[PDB]
Amino acid sequence: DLSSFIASERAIALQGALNNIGPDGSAVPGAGAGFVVASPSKANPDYFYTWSRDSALTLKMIIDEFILGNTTLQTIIEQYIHAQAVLQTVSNPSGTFLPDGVGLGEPKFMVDGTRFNGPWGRPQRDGPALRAIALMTYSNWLIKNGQFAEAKTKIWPIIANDLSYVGQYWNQSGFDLWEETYASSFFTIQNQHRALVEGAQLAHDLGVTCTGCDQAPEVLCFLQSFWNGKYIVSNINVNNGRTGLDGNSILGAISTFDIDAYCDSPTLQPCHSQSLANFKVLTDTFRNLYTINAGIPEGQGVAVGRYAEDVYMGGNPWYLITTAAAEFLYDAVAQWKARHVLTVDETSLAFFKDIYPEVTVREYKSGNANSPFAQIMDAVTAYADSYVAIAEKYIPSNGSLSEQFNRDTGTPLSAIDLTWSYAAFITMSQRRAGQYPSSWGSRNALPPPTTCSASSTPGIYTPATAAGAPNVTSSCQVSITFNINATTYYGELYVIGNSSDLGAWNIADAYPLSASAYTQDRPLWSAAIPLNAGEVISYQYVRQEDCDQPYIYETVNRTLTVPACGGAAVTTDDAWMGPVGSSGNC
Ligand SMILES: *[C@@H]1O[C@H](CO)[C@@H](O[C@@H]2O[C@H](CO)[C@@H](O[C@@H]3O[C@H](CO)[C@@H](O)[C@H](O[C@H]4O[C@H](CO[C@H]5O[C@H](CO)[C@@H](O)[C@H](O)[C@@H]5O)[C@@H](O)[C@H](O)[C@@H]4O)[C@@H]3O)[C@H](O)[C@H]2NC(C)=O)[C@H](O)[C@H]1NC(C)=O
Ligand SMILES: C[C@H]1O[C@H](O[C@H]2[C@H](O)[C@@H](O)[C@@H](O[C@H]3[C@H](O)[C@@H](O)[C@@H](O)O[C@@H]3CO)O[C@@H]2CO)[C@H](O)[C@@H](O)[C@@H]1N[C@H]1C=C(CO)[C@@H](O)[C@H](O)[C@H]1O
Ligand SMILES: *[C@@H]1O[C@H](CO)[C@@H](O[C@@H]2O[C@H](CO)[C@@H](O)[C@H](O)[C@H]2NC(C)=O)[C@H](O)[C@H]1NC(C)=O
Ligand SMILES: *[C@@H]1O[C@H](CO)[C@@H](O[C@@H]2O[C@H](CO)[C@@H](O)[C@H](O)[C@H]2NC(C)=O)[C@H](O)[C@H]1NC(C)=O
Ligand SMILES: *[C@@H]1O[C@H](CO)[C@@H](O[C@@H]2O[C@H](CO)[C@@H](O)[C@H](O)[C@H]2NC(C)=O)[C@H](O)[C@H]1NC(C)=O
Ligand SMILES: *[C@@H]1O[C@H](CO)[C@@H](O[C@@H]2O[C@H](CO)[C@@H](O)[C@H](O)[C@H]2NC(C)=O)[C@H](O)[C@H]1NC(C)=O
Ligand SMILES: *[C@@H]1O[C@H](CO)[C@@H](O)[C@H](O)[C@H]1NC(C)=O
Ligand SMILES: *[C@@H]1O[C@H](CO)[C@@H](O)[C@H](O)[C@H]1NC(C)=O
């Protein structure tokens, strides 16, 4: 059946994703160490960059795939732990890492892990959640499989910063997952709820204090505001002229998936009534929008895009969203079987009447095979198959999943070999089988208070250190090269200043200059010093001497201010202003 030709595409998708990940990635030449590229397409659209969302979302698949079957994925997982451990410290246009921990929200870096200076929709506030959720789903396996040390000592201090970010900044606005609307997004809030609830449980079992986990009830309280009568508005707290119907909604449910949960829960699961009623109106608008969905019935899946007002490269359906729309049904079908009950609410009745004509407002219970409960279950999973069916049509023969496939003609376009779309296909294919990840602890989640309160506890941000080894003394240090004309020996002189990095007026901790390009023509000593930005550093060169002779300072103290964070790599040009004393002979 179709089961064969999606099992083959899953295997292609593994390589498609893995080839985009450095260092040993076939698709990406350049830059490695555990940084996942979204797409190798350097040609427009230029997607040759690492997105902290895409990186953390595709690696969540890799970890969950690693849990069942593949063990060679451990190599790329453990480089990612090193990668993001470093990436944390990288000062970027959103902000620096230390003082308030603002730089973690920056969505996009170079395939290196150097800053992306260009203009962008920042901050995005969801990467920290997905990166926490990724590392928490790996570290909670390590504690279960007799490697507690790694989870506690090295992986945790990465997570500690990322859910400190969520604790401190959930209630301030950001950009949505589509990098467009500067507003409180549903996908961003629902995933960063999970990062506190699941993060609190791992903090408990590791035996450490999660700063930021406090806000889990208040984040869940605010998540109730997104619902809107018939459907769920994805971006709340702005007016951008959009409906609110958005793939954002589906992608939030599938990425915050739990099997032990019931549809009663206020975390808004795939099987929850309001989420089903959204899926109806959301998929029905795309059923009517695109020419591809010309007269497809109400009981059959269709090409799903991101929103009705989408204009990005035509306003098309997306591969990752159309697969996630199937996964949404495969999540819901599993949850009803898991909890053995279907309380079909009148708010969610419009969903079921398409799939099963003779539904009511009953509590359908897990009875016989061929009973009504099983018939609804077998119809919903059949409805899920039609979403992957129409996906299989517009997926090409060689299996190259792009970002989008065209609105009208259905041929592929946009970024070629998108890592998300491969991962989203794998996440879907897992859920077709019984391969569900784990209970992140939705039942143990603290329910929302009586009234919501605007709040955010200020978390603290220590470097990962054990994972990746930056260890930052202070925020955004800029490079500055001292050069000095000093006539002396052609090889084998120091520099001190009022700053701590230089010395603070002592010659034991003074920085030694190298005589690399010293010549008769140009007697240059030099030293590239990474020291703090925005400081009027008062420096002075000094000469160390042979046969235990004392040090010889220059006659005057120089001062030149090092420029502010975010570039301007200055190089000073001084000469020796004082007497070069007596040389040695001993
Ligand atoms: C930080 O957290 C705090 C809470 O901890 C957040 O504060 C809450 O923000 C909510 C969203 O702005 C707000 O909800 C609305 O409150 C007003 C009254 O102030 C209600 O009238 C609204 O209900 C009505 O509208 C909804 C949706 O219908 C449409 O209309 C609204 C605009 O009115 C649109 O936003 C929406 O897109 C829809 O098109 C209906 O479903 C209702 O039936 C009703 O008609 C909302 O509930 C909370 O009141 C507010 N709470 C407090 C205590 O301040 C804060 O926003 C958050 N900030 C960030 C950045 O995350
Ligand atoms: C890849 C991204 O492209 C689109 O958005 C970005 C634009 O391409 C850029 O031009 C830039 O826009 C800024 C203007 O240049 C600047 O003049 C100023 O007005 O600010 C603008 C931004 O506010 O940055 C845009 C992003 O903010 C497109 O709208 C967006 O959806 C695209 N993102 C997708 C790509 C990936 C790849 O990993 C996914 O992470 C996202 O979910 C996708 O939505
Ligand atoms: C487990 O992961 C490995 C990658 O580490 C997969 O290996 C690829 O398998 C395909 C099979 O068609 C080959 O064509 C590739 O050449 C393999 N690549 C490498 C680098 O080994 C493997 O298929 C995965 N297995 C399962 C069961 O998921
Ligand atoms: C696999 O199929 C994809 C379908 O996208 C091929 O990508 C196209 O490659 C050609 C090369 O000339 C480009 O002109 C097209 O623009 C690409 N497609 C898109 C959507 O941009 C890919 O080359 C194929 N790989 C093979 C046959 O090895
Ligand atoms: C990271 O660097 C700082 C200094 O920039 C180190 O801080 C010292 O920590 C030790 C205890 O481990 C204290 O006794 C010192 O007083 C601290 N300050 C200084 C200025 O030395 C810190 O230990 C480093 N961390 C790692 C893991 O190497
Ligand atoms: C340090 O020595 C270098 C020697 O090159 C000086 O740089 C030269 O300065 C002269 C000024 O007459 C220029 O004509 C040359 O083109 C410069 N050469 C280079 C390589 O820069 C420099 O000015 C000296 N600095 C101080 C502070 O005395
Ligand atoms: C270095 O000296 C300058 C003199 O203007 C001063 O402003 C600055 O604060 C000093 N920095 C120190 C002592 O770290
Ligand atoms: C200037 O340098 C001398 C070196 O001995 C030092 O003692 C003095 O404190 C410095 N003064 C300033 C203002 O930098």
mmCIF file of C-alpha atoms in Angstrom, residues 51-363:
data_model
loop_
_atom_site.group_PDB
_atom_site.id
_atom_site.type_symbol
_atom_site.label_atom_id
_atom_site.label_comp_id
_atom_site.label_asym_id
_atom_site.label_seq_id
_atom_site.Cartn_x
_atom_site.Cartn_y
_atom_site.Cartn_z
ATOM 1 C CA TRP A 51 18.112 28.488 12.843
ATOM 2 C CA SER A 52 17.954 27.690 16.585
ATOM 3 C CA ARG A 53 14.300 26.625 16.055
ATOM 4 C CA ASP A 54 15.069 24.309 13.092
ATOM 5 C CA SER A 55 18.225 23.003 14.824
ATOM 6 C CA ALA A 56 16.370 22.236 18.086
ATOM 7 C CA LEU A 57 13.269 20.879 16.307
ATOM 8 C CA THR A 58 15.123 18.587 13.862
ATOM 9 C CA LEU A 59 17.419 17.282 16.626
ATOM 10 C CA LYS A 60 14.370 16.468 18.796
ATOM 11 C CA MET A 61 13.462 14.056 15.965
ATOM 12 C CA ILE A 62 17.063 12.734 15.890
ATOM 13 C CA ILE A 63 17.024 12.109 19.668
ATOM 14 C CA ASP A 64 13.551 10.488 19.502
ATOM 15 C CA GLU A 65 14.714 8.388 16.507
ATOM 16 C CA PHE A 66 17.859 7.503 18.518
ATOM 17 C CA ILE A 67 15.723 6.242 21.463
ATOM 18 C CA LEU A 68 14.217 3.526 19.203
ATOM 19 C CA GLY A 69 16.598 1.689 16.844
ATOM 20 C CA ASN A 70 19.435 3.886 15.562
ATOM 21 C CA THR A 71 22.484 4.225 17.843
ATOM 22 C CA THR A 72 24.847 5.995 15.368
ATOM 23 C CA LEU A 73 22.826 9.228 15.850
ATOM 24 C CA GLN A 74 24.525 9.631 19.289
ATOM 25 C CA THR A 75 27.584 11.119 17.541
ATOM 26 C CA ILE A 76 25.620 14.002 15.948
ATOM 27 C CA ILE A 77 23.559 14.460 19.185
ATOM 28 C CA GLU A 78 26.654 14.908 21.379
ATOM 29 C CA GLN A 79 28.255 17.413 18.945
ATOM 30 C CA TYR A 80 24.974 19.414 19.077
ATOM 31 C CA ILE A 81 25.286 19.484 22.894
ATOM 32 C CA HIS A 82 28.770 20.995 22.378
ATOM 33 C CA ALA A 83 27.459 23.260 19.575
ATOM 34 C CA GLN A 84 24.590 24.913 21.456
ATOM 35 C CA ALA A 85 26.692 25.076 24.652
ATOM 36 C CA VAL A 86 29.007 27.472 22.780
ATOM 37 C CA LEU A 87 26.231 29.186 20.744
ATOM 38 C CA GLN A 88 24.691 30.394 24.058
ATOM 39 C CA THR A 89 27.641 32.741 24.740
ATOM 40 C CA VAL A 90 27.650 34.263 21.213
ATOM 41 C CA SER A 91 26.751 37.967 21.425
ATOM 42 C CA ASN A 92 24.266 38.825 18.660
ATOM 43 C CA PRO A 93 21.914 41.673 17.553
ATOM 44 C CA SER A 94 19.217 40.557 20.053
ATOM 45 C CA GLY A 95 21.738 40.959 22.894
ATOM 46 C CA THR A 96 24.593 39.676 25.075
ATOM 47 C CA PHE A 97 24.612 36.460 27.150
ATOM 48 C CA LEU A 98 25.691 37.443 30.696
ATOM 49 C CA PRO A 99 24.021 40.518 32.268
ATOM 50 C CA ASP A 100 20.330 39.693 31.634
ATOM 51 C CA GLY A 101 20.592 36.701 29.238
ATOM 52 C CA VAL A 102 19.018 38.448 26.245
ATOM 53 C CA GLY A 103 21.036 36.903 23.368
ATOM 54 C CA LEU A 104 19.408 33.438 23.591
ATOM 55 C CA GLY A 105 16.285 34.620 21.715
ATOM 56 C CA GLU A 106 18.163 35.386 18.464
ATOM 57 C CA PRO A 107 16.666 32.894 15.958
ATOM 58 C CA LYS A 108 19.416 32.687 13.337
ATOM 59 C CA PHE A 109 23.205 32.315 13.306
ATOM 60 C CA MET A 110 25.812 31.568 10.637
ATOM 61 C CA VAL A 111 26.610 27.894 9.833
ATOM 62 C CA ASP A 112 29.619 28.588 12.107
ATOM 63 C CA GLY A 113 27.988 29.932 15.236
ATOM 64 C CA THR A 114 29.320 33.450 14.612
ATOM 65 C CA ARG A 115 26.742 36.264 14.897
ATOM 66 C CA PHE A 116 24.323 37.119 12.072
ATOM 67 C CA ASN A 117 24.499 40.934 11.846
ATOM 68 C CA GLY A 118 21.822 41.510 9.162
ATOM 69 C CA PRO A 119 18.268 42.761 9.840
ATOM 70 C CA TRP A 120 15.802 40.070 10.933
ATOM 71 C CA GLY A 121 12.604 39.354 12.892
ATOM 72 C CA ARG A 122 14.113 39.260 16.389
ATOM 73 C CA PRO A 123 13.729 38.270 19.131
ATOM 74 C CA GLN A 124 11.734 35.032 18.590
ATOM 75 C CA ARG A 125 11.623 33.600 22.171
ATOM 76 C CA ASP A 126 10.792 29.977 21.088
ATOM 77 C CA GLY A 127 14.265 28.567 20.267
ATOM 78 C CA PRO A 128 15.163 28.385 23.997
ATOM 79 C CA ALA A 129 12.021 26.295 24.627
ATOM 80 C CA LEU A 130 12.631 23.859 21.724
ATOM 81 C CA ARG A 131 16.362 23.624 22.608
ATOM 82 C CA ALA A 132 15.454 22.887 26.243
ATOM 83 C CA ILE A 133 12.805 20.353 25.113
ATOM 84 C CA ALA A 134 15.412 18.693 22.849
ATOM 85 C CA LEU A 135 18.131 18.412 25.527
ATOM 86 C CA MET A 136 15.582 17.396 28.204
ATOM 87 C CA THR A 137 14.324 14.511 26.006
ATOM 88 C CA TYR A 138 17.964 13.293 25.614
ATOM 89 C CA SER A 139 19.096 13.842 29.225
ATOM 90 C CA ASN A 140 16.035 12.062 30.713
ATOM 91 C CA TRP A 141 17.057 8.984 28.659
ATOM 92 C CA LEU A 142 20.626 9.211 30.050
ATOM 93 C CA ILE A 143 19.383 9.137 33.676
ATOM 94 C CA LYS A 144 17.115 6.173 32.777
ATOM 95 C CA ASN A 145 19.979 4.307 31.007
ATOM 96 C CA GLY A 146 22.634 4.599 33.756
ATOM 97 C CA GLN A 147 24.480 7.760 32.699
ATOM 98 C CA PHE A 148 23.181 10.245 35.277
ATOM 99 C CA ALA A 149 26.516 12.116 35.482
ATOM 100 C CA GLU A 150 26.274 13.401 31.885
ATOM 101 C CA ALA A 151 22.686 14.644 32.347
ATOM 102 C CA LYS A 152 23.481 16.488 35.608
ATOM 103 C CA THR A 153 27.047 17.806 35.164
ATOM 104 C CA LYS A 154 27.226 18.785 31.454
ATOM 105 C CA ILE A 155 23.791 18.865 29.727
ATOM 106 C CA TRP A 156 21.847 20.648 32.533
ATOM 107 C CA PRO A 157 23.712 24.026 32.594
ATOM 108 C CA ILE A 158 22.717 24.439 28.905
ATOM 109 C CA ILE A 159 19.043 23.815 29.824
ATOM 110 C CA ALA A 160 19.332 26.024 32.959
ATOM 111 C CA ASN A 161 19.995 29.102 30.787
ATOM 112 C CA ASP A 162 17.320 28.350 28.167
ATOM 113 C CA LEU A 163 14.428 27.919 30.657
ATOM 114 C CA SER A 164 15.809 30.866 32.680
ATOM 115 C CA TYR A 165 15.164 32.778 29.427
ATOM 116 C CA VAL A 166 11.594 31.477 29.244
ATOM 117 C CA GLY A 167 11.052 32.301 32.936
ATOM 118 C CA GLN A 168 12.351 35.857 32.433
ATOM 119 C CA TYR A 169 10.861 36.685 28.997
ATOM 120 C CA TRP A 170 7.680 34.611 28.312
ATOM 121 C CA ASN A 171 5.369 37.550 29.139
ATOM 122 C CA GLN A 172 7.224 40.020 26.873
ATOM 123 C CA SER A 173 6.376 39.870 23.158
ATOM 124 C CA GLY A 174 8.456 38.409 20.314
ATOM 125 C CA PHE A 175 8.266 37.229 16.698
ATOM 126 C CA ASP A 176 6.231 34.125 15.779
ATOM 127 C CA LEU A 177 7.685 30.919 14.241
ATOM 128 C CA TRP A 178 7.125 32.377 10.726
ATOM 129 C CA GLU A 179 9.470 35.328 11.585
ATOM 130 C CA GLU A 180 6.889 37.982 10.623
ATOM 131 C CA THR A 181 4.304 39.070 13.203
ATOM 132 C CA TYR A 182 5.837 40.760 16.272
ATOM 133 C CA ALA A 183 3.299 39.362 18.751
ATOM 134 C CA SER A 184 2.498 36.744 21.382
ATOM 135 C CA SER A 185 2.393 33.525 19.307
ATOM 136 C CA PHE A 186 0.559 30.278 20.182
ATOM 137 C CA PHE A 187 3.369 27.918 19.065
ATOM 138 C CA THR A 188 5.900 29.947 21.063
ATOM 139 C CA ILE A 189 3.754 29.987 24.247
ATOM 140 C CA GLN A 190 2.616 26.326 24.150
ATOM 141 C CA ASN A 191 6.168 24.985 23.619
ATOM 142 C CA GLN A 192 7.694 27.291 26.263
ATOM 143 C CA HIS A 193 4.989 26.127 28.716
ATOM 144 C CA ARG A 194 6.239 22.555 28.178
ATOM 145 C CA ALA A 195 9.885 23.633 28.690
ATOM 146 C CA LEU A 196 9.060 24.792 32.258
ATOM 147 C CA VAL A 197 6.818 21.830 33.226
ATOM 148 C CA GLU A 198 9.072 19.100 31.795
ATOM 149 C CA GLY A 199 12.129 21.138 32.891
ATOM 150 C CA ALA A 200 10.873 21.267 36.502
ATOM 151 C CA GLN A 201 10.584 17.455 36.638
ATOM 152 C CA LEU A 202 14.133 16.950 35.282
ATOM 153 C CA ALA A 203 15.433 19.604 37.717
ATOM 154 C CA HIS A 204 13.833 17.590 40.549
ATOM 155 C CA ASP A 205 15.341 14.208 39.513
ATOM 156 C CA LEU A 206 18.803 15.732 38.804
ATOM 157 C CA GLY A 207 18.633 17.477 42.205
ATOM 158 C CA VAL A 208 19.110 21.106 41.137
ATOM 159 C CA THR A 209 17.056 24.322 41.388
ATOM 160 C CA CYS A 210 15.394 25.345 38.092
ATOM 161 C CA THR A 211 15.174 29.145 38.126
ATOM 162 C CA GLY A 212 12.363 30.012 35.687
ATOM 163 C CA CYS A 213 10.168 26.929 36.293
ATOM 164 C CA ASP A 214 7.957 29.123 38.582
ATOM 165 C CA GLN A 215 5.992 30.601 35.659
ATOM 166 C CA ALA A 216 4.397 27.345 34.331
ATOM 167 C CA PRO A 217 0.871 28.133 35.665
ATOM 168 C CA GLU A 218 0.935 31.757 34.393
ATOM 169 C CA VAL A 219 2.154 30.693 30.916
ATOM 170 C CA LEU A 220 -0.667 28.109 30.833
ATOM 171 C CA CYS A 221 -3.093 30.829 32.028
ATOM 172 C CA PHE A 222 -2.152 33.109 29.105
ATOM 173 C CA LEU A 223 -2.463 30.194 26.615
ATOM 174 C CA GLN A 224 -6.263 30.244 27.237
ATOM 175 C CA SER A 225 -6.538 33.738 25.626
ATOM 176 C CA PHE A 226 -5.617 32.405 22.144
ATOM 177 C CA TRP A 227 -8.935 30.520 21.696
ATOM 178 C CA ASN A 228 -11.633 32.463 19.823
ATOM 179 C CA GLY A 229 -15.155 30.988 19.788
ATOM 180 C CA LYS A 230 -14.975 28.764 16.685
ATOM 181 C CA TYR A 231 -11.200 28.511 16.049
ATOM 182 C CA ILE A 232 -7.880 29.335 17.761
ATOM 183 C CA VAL A 233 -6.120 32.630 16.929
ATOM 184 C CA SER A 234 -2.409 31.838 16.576
ATOM 185 C CA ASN A 235 -1.092 35.374 17.161
ATOM 186 C CA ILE A 236 -2.809 37.281 19.975
ATOM 187 C CA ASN A 237 -2.065 40.737 21.458
ATOM 188 C CA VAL A 238 -1.751 42.580 18.083
ATOM 189 C CA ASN A 239 -3.715 43.746 15.053
ATOM 190 C CA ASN A 240 -1.931 42.638 11.851
ATOM 191 C CA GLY A 241 -5.077 42.132 9.708
ATOM 192 C CA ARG A 242 -4.811 38.314 9.793
ATOM 193 C CA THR A 243 -7.644 35.879 10.559
ATOM 194 C CA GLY A 244 -5.818 33.914 13.265
ATOM 195 C CA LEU A 245 -6.269 30.598 11.441
ATOM 196 C CA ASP A 246 -2.698 29.365 11.086
ATOM 197 C CA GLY A 247 -0.575 26.182 10.851
ATOM 198 C CA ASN A 248 1.050 27.644 13.973
ATOM 199 C CA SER A 249 -1.902 26.019 15.799
ATOM 200 C CA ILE A 250 -1.309 22.495 14.422
ATOM 201 C CA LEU A 251 2.486 22.744 14.854
ATOM 202 C CA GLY A 252 2.048 23.735 18.528
ATOM 203 C CA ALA A 253 -0.131 20.689 19.250
ATOM 204 C CA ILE A 254 2.125 18.104 17.536
ATOM 205 C CA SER A 255 5.288 19.560 19.168
ATOM 206 C CA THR A 256 3.632 19.543 22.636
ATOM 207 C CA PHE A 257 2.393 15.941 22.322
ATOM 208 C CA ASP A 258 1.718 13.647 25.310
ATOM 209 C CA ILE A 259 0.094 10.179 25.359
ATOM 210 C CA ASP A 260 -0.555 9.853 29.128
ATOM 211 C CA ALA A 261 -2.572 13.121 28.973
ATOM 212 C CA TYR A 262 -6.338 13.243 28.429
ATOM 213 C CA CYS A 263 -8.311 15.633 26.228
ATOM 214 C CA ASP A 264 -9.658 17.405 29.355
ATOM 215 C CA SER A 265 -6.203 18.986 29.970
ATOM 216 C CA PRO A 266 -5.711 22.786 29.607
ATOM 217 C CA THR A 267 -2.343 22.336 27.786
ATOM 218 C CA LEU A 268 -4.380 22.100 24.497
ATOM 219 C CA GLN A 269 -3.480 18.635 23.180
ATOM 220 C CA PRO A 270 -4.312 17.340 19.657
ATOM 221 C CA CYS A 271 -7.302 15.381 21.069
ATOM 222 C CA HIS A 272 -8.620 18.409 23.078
ATOM 223 C CA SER A 273 -11.987 19.717 21.792
ATOM 224 C CA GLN A 274 -10.913 23.297 20.937
ATOM 225 C CA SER A 275 -7.861 21.963 19.025
ATOM 226 C CA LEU A 276 -10.112 19.666 16.910
ATOM 227 C CA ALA A 277 -12.518 22.543 16.122
ATOM 228 C CA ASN A 278 -9.519 24.626 14.988
ATOM 229 C CA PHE A 279 -8.246 21.792 12.754
ATOM 230 C CA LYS A 280 -11.659 21.805 11.029
ATOM 231 C CA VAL A 281 -11.799 25.529 10.178
ATOM 232 C CA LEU A 282 -8.023 25.742 9.578
ATOM 233 C CA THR A 283 -7.961 22.858 7.071
ATOM 234 C CA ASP A 284 -11.303 23.951 5.492
ATOM 235 C CA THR A 285 -9.910 27.429 4.657
ATOM 236 C CA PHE A 286 -6.928 25.829 2.864
ATOM 237 C CA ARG A 287 -9.391 23.375 1.234
ATOM 238 C CA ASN A 288 -10.996 26.477 -0.334
ATOM 239 C CA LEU A 289 -7.849 28.689 -0.791
ATOM 240 C CA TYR A 290 -5.546 26.689 -3.063
ATOM 241 C CA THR A 291 -6.369 25.442 -6.585
ATOM 242 C CA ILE A 292 -4.845 22.040 -5.672
ATOM 243 C CA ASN A 293 -7.837 21.488 -3.344
ATOM 244 C CA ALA A 294 -10.422 21.797 -6.140
ATOM 245 C CA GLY A 295 -13.514 20.006 -4.828
ATOM 246 C CA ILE A 296 -11.841 17.662 -2.338
ATOM 247 C CA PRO A 297 -14.580 16.334 0.059
ATOM 248 C CA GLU A 298 -14.940 17.315 3.731
ATOM 249 C CA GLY A 299 -13.909 13.790 4.841
ATOM 250 C CA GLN A 300 -10.561 13.830 2.970
ATOM 251 C CA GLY A 301 -7.267 15.611 3.713
ATOM 252 C CA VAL A 302 -5.906 18.490 1.652
ATOM 253 C CA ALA A 303 -2.817 20.617 0.955
ATOM 254 C CA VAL A 304 -2.202 22.678 4.118
ATOM 255 C CA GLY A 305 -0.260 25.979 4.201
ATOM 256 C CA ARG A 306 0.706 28.373 6.988
ATOM 257 C CA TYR A 307 -1.985 31.089 6.720
ATOM 258 C CA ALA A 308 -4.699 32.441 4.385
ATOM 259 C CA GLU A 309 -2.842 35.779 3.989
ATOM 260 C CA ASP A 310 0.528 34.103 3.175
ATOM 261 C CA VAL A 311 2.460 35.916 0.409
ATOM 262 C CA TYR A 312 5.950 34.381 0.865
ATOM 263 C CA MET A 313 6.970 33.040 -2.564
ATOM 264 C CA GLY A 314 3.349 32.780 -3.805
ATOM 265 C CA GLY A 315 1.460 31.904 -0.602
ATOM 266 C CA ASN A 316 1.729 28.138 -0.949
ATOM 267 C CA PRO A 317 1.165 24.907 1.014
ATOM 268 C CA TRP A 318 4.155 23.651 3.044
ATOM 269 C CA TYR A 319 5.496 20.072 3.201
ATOM 270 C CA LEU A 320 6.137 20.249 6.971
ATOM 271 C CA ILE A 321 2.643 21.590 7.783
ATOM 272 C CA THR A 322 0.809 19.088 5.540
ATOM 273 C CA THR A 323 2.658 16.173 7.215
ATOM 274 C CA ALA A 324 2.059 17.751 10.658
ATOM 275 C CA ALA A 325 -1.677 17.935 9.816
ATOM 276 C CA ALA A 326 -1.615 14.129 9.449
ATOM 277 C CA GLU A 327 0.509 13.767 12.618
ATOM 278 C CA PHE A 328 -2.135 15.872 14.435
ATOM 279 C CA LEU A 329 -4.704 13.146 13.632
ATOM 280 C CA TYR A 330 -2.212 10.351 14.439
ATOM 281 C CA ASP A 331 -1.624 12.045 17.836
ATOM 282 C CA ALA A 332 -5.374 12.362 18.531
ATOM 283 C CA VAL A 333 -6.130 8.765 17.444
ATOM 284 C CA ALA A 334 -3.441 7.493 19.873
ATOM 285 C CA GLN A 335 -4.640 9.613 22.821
ATOM 286 C CA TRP A 336 -8.241 8.318 22.597
ATOM 287 C CA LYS A 337 -6.968 4.708 22.455
ATOM 288 C CA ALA A 338 -4.542 5.471 25.322
ATOM 289 C CA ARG A 339 -7.155 6.964 27.688
ATOM 290 C CA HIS A 340 -9.957 4.664 26.402
ATOM 291 C CA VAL A 341 -12.528 7.491 26.113
ATOM 292 C CA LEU A 342 -13.911 10.050 23.649
ATOM 293 C CA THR A 343 -16.056 12.773 25.235
ATOM 294 C CA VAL A 344 -17.233 14.219 21.894
ATOM 295 C CA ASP A 345 -18.093 17.823 22.837
ATOM 296 C CA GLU A 346 -20.537 19.995 20.843
ATOM 297 C CA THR A 347 -17.714 22.558 20.388
ATOM 298 C CA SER A 348 -15.738 19.798 18.561
ATOM 299 C CA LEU A 349 -18.739 18.069 16.873
ATOM 300 C CA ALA A 350 -18.106 19.741 13.480
ATOM 301 C CA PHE A 351 -14.783 17.841 13.285
ATOM 302 C CA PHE A 352 -16.292 14.358 13.740
ATOM 303 C CA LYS A 353 -19.420 14.772 11.547
ATOM 304 C CA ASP A 354 -17.128 14.964 8.470
ATOM 305 C CA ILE A 355 -15.241 11.781 9.374
ATOM 306 C CA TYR A 356 -18.117 9.772 10.905
ATOM 307 C CA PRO A 357 -21.627 10.871 9.825
ATOM 308 C CA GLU A 358 -23.685 9.480 12.769
ATOM 309 C CA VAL A 359 -21.868 11.003 15.784
ATOM 310 C CA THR A 360 -23.630 12.652 18.737
ATOM 311 C CA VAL A 361 -22.759 14.208 22.139
ATOM 312 C CA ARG A 362 -21.916 10.827 23.740
ATOM 313 C CA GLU A 363 -19.031 9.422 25.773
#
